[PDB]
Structure formats: structure tokens, C-alpha cells
Amino acid sequence: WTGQESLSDSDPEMWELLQREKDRQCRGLELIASENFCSRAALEALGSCLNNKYSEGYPGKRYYGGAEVVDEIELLCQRRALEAFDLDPAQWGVNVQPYSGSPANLAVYTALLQPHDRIMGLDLPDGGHLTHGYMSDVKRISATSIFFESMPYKLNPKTGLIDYNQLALTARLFRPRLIIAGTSAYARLIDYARMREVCDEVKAHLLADMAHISGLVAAKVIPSPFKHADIVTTTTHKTLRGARSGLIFYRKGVKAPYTFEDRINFAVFPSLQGGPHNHAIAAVAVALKQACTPMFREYSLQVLKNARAMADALLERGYSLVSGGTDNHLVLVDLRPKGLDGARAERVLELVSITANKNTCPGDRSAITPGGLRLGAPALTSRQFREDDFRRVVDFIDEGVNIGLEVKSKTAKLQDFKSFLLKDSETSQRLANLRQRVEQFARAFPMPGFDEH
Amino acid sequence: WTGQESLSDSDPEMWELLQREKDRQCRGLELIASENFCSRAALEALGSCLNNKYSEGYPGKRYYGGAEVVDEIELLCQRRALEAFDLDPAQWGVNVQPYSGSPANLAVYTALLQPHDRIMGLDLPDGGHLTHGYMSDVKRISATSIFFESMPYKLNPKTGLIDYNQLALTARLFRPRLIIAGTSAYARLIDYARMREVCDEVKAHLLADMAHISGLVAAKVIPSPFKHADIVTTTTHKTLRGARSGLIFYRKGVKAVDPKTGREIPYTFEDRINFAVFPSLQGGPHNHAIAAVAVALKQACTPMFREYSLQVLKNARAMADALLERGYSLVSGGTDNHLVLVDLRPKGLDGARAERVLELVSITANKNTCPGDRSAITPGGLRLGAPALTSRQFREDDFRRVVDFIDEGVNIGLEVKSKTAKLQDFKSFLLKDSETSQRLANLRQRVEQFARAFPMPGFDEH
């Protein structure tokens, strides 16, 4: 044993599984709005000797020896993050150690709030994220609703837009110390200036969780939350097309001085995390450099066009979209008026290599059996899909939904639905026929990453 | 732009830094006890298309479509973890989604405790970890002392061993709901049976944080905490030699039998642990890390690993023997595991100064707290570990040579200390003084010529 044997020689079971997943990604219409295809260059840094290093602390102030190279990598990642978002280093700092998006948000709360201090985020079924303080009527779900006191704000149900007037009314009574502007399943742009007004009136910090839209912000194809936010968090693996990781941006310098920096860094380490994952930090720096290029603006412009084309195609086939369209990378389809639930839709489409996720819609009370379906353009746009290609995607989807509707008319419970798809010979044949056409269409496009893993 | 370009071509600035770190690892004597050199096979899974997948939930019950293969990977990882520690699947389950060791411990507390419930861990300067509830006299340091109420247990400073009697005394008064058995800088074996006795008397859960010793446990070269513990957490990147990640093991199945109804009373850990990891604390699982861990766990079930782990014990003992022959003080007087903790206060040198001098000589360790220390930034000790260099085929005689180099560097550091006052001056002197810099450059060349002769797991160039 040398530790230098290749994966294919030393663990053929695992190596097969890797090829199977790579093939699955190549042959399918991958429409999960929070997924993307990472470049090989970033993946090569992710799987490197940087895994081996403990470097707790911050550059030039570490708790271990031997950190001179990872010091330069971390410093380089910080600089590339600021450049990518066109930030003045005298006005903004960045912490690049959060393991992912959820740890990044929890660190912001721990840094700025005492236990049981008050936060406000968009309610999950209305499009907010778990870590924005989500609890249901029956149960505190996110730890951000356990260690802190959360009250949600809501969409206007008639329009599908955030009700900024009701947010302002309730914020005066609830008195949050922090308000979160960021979404997981909202197809429109956020009025960050109006959020700033509310925060200024009640003396709350404004945190922008731009995880989903960060790549679009870097390419400057949509307005930037950095103009109005006190703190900005993001993941690096959605529209930024990087490895899985998180980032915290914070204002520094003179406000009228800002005191975010020391508290944010302390909350990440030593308070919440242990040793940084230097392989992820390096992979993030690689993707951030790619995001500064005119190539990336062109990609992000195409992401917007492809999502609009997808939405237009769905609207003309009679589908209901939450908020009536899109201004970003995703669409949220409310299947309730079509007579199908998100769980059944996700399953049928998955069987024909169309990959999405079921999603809550306004008014839903179950996330396991919700009424909607979320679709995103980023991943397939990275395979050079164009508007007409997304119009074809929508043809394939309708075709799968119609199969799902027919199976629903012949079954009662969800277990019956799932079994029927596999056992009925007639349905199985239409499924395979559609599957073959989808996979033949998808495999023709290029795919970022390694060729076989 | 394809996204298929190599790192060396598309980002030479990053690629050069990668190679400098690779070369630094090859040329140095890497003695950080919590570090190791991951195999190439695990690294190939770490840098894979598995990075691209969202698969929140657990196998069979996902919140996203397209999870058929990652389901198989997550299940395979769970099976290999159980096999690696010889665990009956009817009595033990494992959660393989924690991003690292600190998130693993935080999930356990969140699963089993309400906010402000009581925990007890070994005090940090005594060898316990940050996430075992550490708070100082002046501030709450770990979030495990903010969201929960902690009280530390301590070492018998006479013997350097955990004072089990004092733990029993204080636990009866403090009434913890959970006691943590596990350490970051303790060279002896933990009496888990005595831990369990205390827990049973006060009705506390017993959590074993075996992060540092997990590889030794898997190889069955030291007694296993699974016999007495309710919950077991570990990292995968120390003695297990894998990618950076965490694991949570928990008991399942029958706990007792109701004597009147004759029926089984089950453990209730599984659903709470799984819920605390997701949806409560984490978001999307890092499937590339999970796959890399499964690769490392399979390597741990081989006879090669047992021999490796046995050699780690022998190398750490030979290094402790050599340090003792040369007049050095070890906390607890030696070691029974993979590390030694050197108390340099009797020699009149602090840990920050010693770390620096050795680092300039390509001897990489870390300064560390010792019993009675008040500062972690300027502690009295130096921690040394055998796992990383044992992965490079070092044997006991090679670790004896390592101690020779260490003694040379420490002696140069004492000389510089006599010539300087403040830490910034000691440090500047190492680069300014032509003589000192020539002594350091001479020792460095010898160190690197010795270290480069040994093999290195991983890729050859990154």
C-alpha cells in the first residue's frame, strides 16, 4: 500500500458508482435550480493535498505551523471574492471559511445576536429558506428558530410578490434585530432599498442571502444587494458554478465605525467551526476568477433568457406560475390547479430523466407532499442550451406531466401511483419511449468537469 | 470556455500554490497530531461530479429528484462505517452527513438537549476540545457554551490523568444531561467504564468524541468506546486518513425489556440525531466528501491498516522515549496513543516561540495548551503526533532522528530567547541575525534531505 493507487484500481465498487452518477448527469435534463456543473479546474483543487492541512485561525494568525502557503490561498480567495463583486476592500471584508450556506447564515446570527434575539425572514412556503428562521405551526424545524426567535413575512397572495407594506407593519411591532432578504424559490427581484427603509426604521441589520442569485449579481445582470445590505451571505455552488462552500461579506470602515468584522470572524472560528476546508477554499477561488470574465456575463445573460423562455413556454401551455413569470434563473410551477401534486410530478419526470424537485407554493402546509415544482436554467445553460432548447425541455415536461395525470386518474394513494409507473406495461412503455427521446436530446450537449467522473 | 480545461492551464496562479503546498508536505517533518496524508483514491472521489448534486434528506426520502446513485453511495458509506468499527447494524446506526467534527458534536447536542441544558467536558487546557463546552473566565468561546450550559472536568495535576473521582463529585451537584468523553491533547486512554458509571448515577448520556483515536479504534489496537458509549462522534481526516468530514454513531434497537409486559423498550436516538443534522442544522449534504469517506473506510478494514495503526503506537512511544531521554517533560509522563504533549515551561521556552523556530526548519507542529495554561495564543506546550509520518513509512528509528532535529531547533530557540525579549523581537531575530539564519538554514537542509527520501500518499503533483 502506497496511497497512490488510483480509485478505479483500489475501489472498483466506488469507481462504478462515480461513473454512474456522471452518466446520469450527462443524459438528463437537470433542472434543479440550486444545481450547476462545476468546472474541472475547480474540481482539481477540491480533490488535492489541501485536504491534509489544519490551519485554524486567519492568515498570519494561525493556531498551527506550516500555514504559509494556505495563508496565500485564503488571502487570494478573499481578494478574488471582492473583485468578483466589484467591492472596495476598504468598505467590505469577506470570510471564506464557512463550510456551506447554512453554516454561513448561522454564523452571522451567532456573531450579531444573543440567544433568543429576534429575526425576520420570508416564510418558507412563500419562498424563504430554512435557515431564515423557519418553524411551522407544529414544530421548530430550523435550528435558527430554536436558538433565535423568528417571525416570518409573507407574499401578497393575489400578486405573488413580497408584501413590503405588511413587512413594515409587522416589523414595527415585532422589533427584529435582523431582517433577512433572500429566497430559495422566489422568481422576482427583491426591493433591497425598501428593505433598507424598514431596517432603518426599526434599527435592524439587513442581511442579504444571495445564494441563488450570486452568479447573476457577479455578472451585473441584476441589481446588487451590496448597495443596501449590512451583511451578505452566499453559497458558491449555485449560479456561481463553484465547489460547495459558503461566504460571508460584511461592511467595514466608517458608517458615520462598523464593528462587524471581529464578531463575524470570531463566530466562524473558534465559536462555530473547526479546521477550515482549504481544498474547498481553493476550489472557490478558482470559480471566482472565472466569474470575473466576460464569458461569465454572457453565460449569466443566457441564464436569464433561458428561464424567461422556459416560463413563456409553460404559460402558453396553461401552467400556473407563482408571481406569473420570472425575472431570474428559476420558475415555480403551481401544479395544484392542474390536479397533480409536486411529489407525483417529480417522480414521473425523474423516471424519464427530467430532474427537478417538488417545492412548496404559497399556502402549502407539507414540504414532503407540496403542490409545486421548481425549475431552474443554470445547469443546462452551462451545457450551452439556448432558448429554443428550453422550449424543447418544456415540450418533454408537458409530456411527462400528462403521463402523470393519466396514472393519477387510475390510482388512489401515492404508493399506488409509484407502483403503477413501474408495473403497468402500457405506462412503462410510454415512459421508456419518452426517456429515450430525452436522453438522446441531452447527451448531445457538452458537459463541464472530468470526462468520466 | 468548456469547463473541461485543466487547472494548470486555466489558473496557473492557483496551480502554482497547489504545488508549493504539495512540496511543503513532502519536504517537511509533519508532526501535527490531527493531520494525515489522504490517499489518492479518496482524493479522486473528493474532486468529483458528486459536488454538483443536491440530495437533502436521507436515502429513499429525498427532497430532490435524481438521487438514485447518491442514495447508493450514502448507504454504502453507512455500511462501511459500521463494518470498519465492527458494529452490529441492529444495535448501531450512523449518520454520515456532518460537514466536519465540530458540526457533528453540535448536531448531537441539538438533537438531545434543549437550549441551556447542561453538559460536562474536559477543560480545554486540560486536553478537551473547543466543542466540549469551552468557555474561559472572561468570555464564552465555543458556541457549545453559548447555546448550552457547560461545566468542565479536570485533570489530576499531580498525575496528569483525568480525575474521575472529582468528576463524579461535581456531576452529582451539576446534574449534566450529557457528559463528553474525548480529547484533543491527552496522551492516555480514557476509562470509559468509569465514565459510564458516573453517567448512570446522574442519568446522563455518554458521548464519546473519538476523533483523534478513531483510526486506532478501527484497527482494534486500543480499547473501543463503543462498549460503553451511547453516542460516538468522530472526524474522518485524522487517524482514519480520509477526507475532511464527520460521522455520528448512535445506539438503536432494544435498550431494556419491560418486566411486566415482557416487551422491548427501544432506543430513541435515531430520529432525533437525523433530524438535528437535517433539516435543523445543515443544508445540502456534501456528496463528494461522503464518497471520499467511504473510500477511506474501506481502506480501514484491511490488514494493512492494522499494521499501520500498530506502527503509529510504536512510533509515538519511541518518540516519547527519546524526548524523555533528552530531558523533556511530557504531560502525564508518556503516551499510550498517537501523540505526545511536551511541557516546555520547565525548559523556559513557550509554545509559540518553539513552533516558529521548528517551522523555519521544516518541522511542522503546533503550539498547545498545557494544564494550568491561561492563553492558547501563547501556551506553554508543543503537541507532536505520529500518524502523518507513519503514513510515509517512518519507523521507530526514524522518529528517534526526528527528536534529534527537534532538540537542535529547540536549543537554537533557547539561545535566541536569551538574546531577545518580546515575541516580535525573538521572531525578527530569526531572520535578521546572519549567524542564526545560517544555523537554521543548515538544520533545514538536513531535515528536508531526510524527509524527502520517504514516499508520500496522494497525487504526485497536487
Ligand SMILES: Nc1nc2c(c(=O)[nH]1)N(C=O)[C@@H](CNc1ccc(C(=O)N[C@@H](CCC(=O)O)C(=O)O)cc1)CN2
Ligand atoms: N422555499 C424553499 N424551497 C425549498 C427549500 C427551502 O429552503 N425553501 N429547500 C431547501 O434547500 C428544499 C426543500 N427542503 C425542505 C426540507 C424540509 C422542510 C420541512 O419543513 N420539513 C419538516 C416538515 C415535513 C412535512 O411534513 O412535509 C420536517 O422535516 O419535519 C422544508 C423544506 C427545496 N425547496
Ligand SMILES: Nc1nc2c(c(=O)[nH]1)N(C=O)[C@@H](CNc1ccc(C(=O)N[C@@H](CCC(=O)O)C(=O)O)cc1)CN2
Ligand atoms: N486541548 C486542545 N488543544 C488544541 C485544540 C483544542 O480544542 N483543545 N485545538 C482545536 O482544534 C487547537 C487550538 N485551537 C484553539 C483555538 C482557540 C482557543 C481559544 O481559547 N481562543 C480564545 C483565547 C485566545 C487567547 O487569548 O489565548 C480566543 O480566540 O478568544 C483555544 C484553542 C489545537 N490544540
Ligand SMILES: Cc1ncc(COP(=O)(O)O)c(/C=N/CC(=O)O)c1O
Ligand atoms: C437562499 C439560500 N440560502 C442558504 C442555502 C443553504 O445552502 P447549503 O445547502 O447549506 O449549502 C440555500 C440552499 N438552497 C437549496 C435549494 O434551494 O435547493 C438557499 O437557497
Ligand SMILES: Cc1ncc(COP(=O)(O)O)c(/C=N/CC(=O)O)c1O
Ligand atoms: C476531539 C475532537 N473533536 C472535534 C474536533 C473538530 O473537528 P473539525 O476541526 O471540526 O473537523 C477536533 C479537532 N481537533 C483539531 C486538533 O486537535 O488539532 C477534535 O480533536
